[PDB]
Each structure stands twice: as structure tokens, then as C-alpha cells.
Design a protein around this ligand. Sequence first.
Ligand SMILES: CCCCCCCC/C=C\CCCCCCCC(=O)OC[C@H](O)CO
Length: 230
Amino acid sequence: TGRPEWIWLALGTALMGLGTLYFLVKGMGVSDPDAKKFYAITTLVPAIAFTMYLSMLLGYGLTMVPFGGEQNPIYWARYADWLFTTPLLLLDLALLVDADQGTILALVGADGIMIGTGLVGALTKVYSYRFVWWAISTAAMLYILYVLFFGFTSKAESMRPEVASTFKVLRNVTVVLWSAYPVVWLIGSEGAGIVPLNIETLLFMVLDVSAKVGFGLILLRSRAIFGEAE
Ligand SMILES: CCCCCCCC/C=C\CCCCCCCC(=O)OC[C@H](O)CO
């Protein structure tokens, strides 16, 4: 409670934990193999985020990085979370549209580059270089968003209508929410430092819960997750 952002870390921990438990209960008894994949991916996402939020709340997922002549508090646990949860969210989208394996690898690999370069930027001690890493990570994000809109055209013709509808909604949620992350980083403690760490933590908490629990609620309530069966 010594760090003002503790309240948002505590709320994030609670919301990710509750979301995990809800998805775990909701997925009980699901037998359809396709739906099992979506429940597994979508329950793992907030479960991982729960552990990383808790690690930030308890102080383990925080480190001090010297730059700008200050000791800057950097929550590195965010990147350990996103390293696994962001490819999993992309996998949800890719499986919906029955993406080619090559497209899945392009997405997951670009996503690993996005998170890894974000982590390097977050830990870099030379201030100006932090924004070089931010730019590379943003380029990887833009590549991901490009694929989400322009890499699935060969699947549109054979796509079930409920699949197309749910994918379109989830893709729009993804573009809007994922785009905000580089902005928050750029203006917050890890970039220019014009927004204080407590407001940055609040912003990432709203984004994370929306991108994980909100996204999951939309996906797991849809008929698109079930194979077409009589
Ligand atoms: C001047 C620096 C130039 C280098 C900047 C690199 C840094 C990372 C930037 C963007 C991510 C690149 C993602 C690379 C993954 C591309 C995979 C691919 O090409 O997939 C095509 C295939 O047809 C399947 O759809």
C-alpha cells in the first residue's frame, strides 16, 4: 500500500482471478474439441495475467532502471505476462478463421518480437534508445494488425457467418485496445514520463482486463467456437 498504484494492481489481480474462475466454471463439461481449444486458450490468458498482476502487487515484478538520472520503477512482470498472453489471444483469432500455419507463425513470431523489444526498451538505460526499441515494437504491432485485416482474405469465402461475425468484432476490439498500449507506454513512466506511474498502471489495468476478460466474454458466448454439428 506504500505505492499509490497498489489499488489498480489489487483490482487487476482480483478481476483477472475472477475472470479465470468464471471461464473455468463455464468451460466445465464442454466436449466439442474445437470449443475445448477456445476455452483452454481463453482461460489460460487471465490465469497468467492473474499471476503477473499478483507479482506486481507483491513487489516481485518491479525493478528500478536508471535513466534520465533517476531510479525509475519498471514493472517488468507485464512483459512476462504479455509474452504468453498476447500470442494466445492471436491464436484465438487465428483458430476462429482457420488460419494457415504460416500465418500463425508470422503472427506469433511478430508478437514475440513486439514483446521482446518492448521489454528491451523498458530496461534500457540510455534514454534516447528506449524510443528506438519502442519504434521497432510498434512496427511489429502494425505488422500484426496488417495481417489481422489483410492476411485472412483467402478464408473469407468458406467462413461460416457466425465465425465471420465473431471474428470481425474481436478483431475490432483487438485493434482498438492493442493500439492504446504503445501510447500508454510512450507517455508513461517507461517513456516520456508525462503521465505518472499510478495513472499509467490504471490505464494498463483497464486495457488488460478489457483485452483479456472482455475479449474472452465476447468469444466464449459465441456459437463460432463450436464445430458445425447437428
Ligand atoms: C530496418 C529494420 C527492418 C527489420 C525490422 C524487423 C523488426 C521487427 C519488425 C516487424 C516484425 C517483423 C515480423 C516478421 C515476420 C514476417 C513473417 C512473414 O513474412 O510471413 C509471411 C508468410 O507468408 C506468412 O503469412
